[PDB]
Scaffold this active site. Sequence first.
Site, short mmCIF file in Angstrom:
data_model
loop_
_atom_site.label_atom_id
_atom_site.label_comp_id
_atom_site.label_asym_id
_atom_site.label_seq_id
_atom_site.Cartn_x
_atom_site.Cartn_y
_atom_site.Cartn_z
N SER A 1 -2.29 -6.57 -1.77
CA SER A 1 -3.43 -6.97 -2.98
C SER A 1 -3.53 -8.72 -2.66
O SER A 1 -4.48 -9.00 -3.61
CB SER A 1 -2.60 -6.74 -4.25
OG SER A 1 -1.59 -7.65 -4.61
N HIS B 1 -1.27 -13.02 -5.54
CA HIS B 1 -2.42 -13.21 -6.12
C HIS B 1 -3.20 -14.45 -6.39
O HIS B 1 -4.35 -14.40 -5.89
CB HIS B 1 -2.44 -12.36 -7.61
CG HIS B 1 -2.01 -11.07 -7.48
ND1 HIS B 1 -1.64 -10.36 -8.54
CD2 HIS B 1 -1.75 -10.24 -6.46
CE1 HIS B 1 -1.10 -9.08 -8.38
NE2 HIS B 1 -1.26 -9.03 -7.11
#
Lengths: 5, 176
Positions: free
Chosen positions: B109, B158
């Site tokens: 991610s 992230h």
Amino acid sequence: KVRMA
Amino acid sequence: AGPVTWVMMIACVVVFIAMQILGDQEVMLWLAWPFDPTLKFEFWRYFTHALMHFSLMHILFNLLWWWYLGGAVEKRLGSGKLIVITLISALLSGYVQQKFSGPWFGGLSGVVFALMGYVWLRGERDPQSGIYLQRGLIIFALIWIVAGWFMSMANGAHIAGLAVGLAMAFVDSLNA
Ligand SMILES: [Cl-]
């Protein structure tokens, strides 16, 4: 704890 | 969809199959970011963390985004471009996630947030590239990131991923 990317 | 898009999706699936046969922890011990300085020359570990997932639904959600945004980059800008974003973001999102809260994390991610940032900024500064991110999806992306500030999200992966994609798109937009 485990972290999710 | 190109070779790099498909190769990465196969890898993540193969590794996830091993995690089901062997258990999470066994794979983690060999693929996670080095938890001990002695392990520091196990070079695969700086990239391998990206391949591990802890839910079927966390891997469905990541390969979707990856195929959509990764496929777009490969198709428009080539395989070499997607390889570079992948390698840099995986390394740097791992590096930052490790410092935030240690070495026990995994998932693509970080690489996804770099693809979100790259596709968006490249499409804005350099429309002729023929990639872009809908303002709707930049909606998603921003809700998704802030929601991790409050499910145990790798928050440093992230932000570092996102930052990496913005910087690369910025540099590539100058040059285009
Ligand atoms: Cl975190």
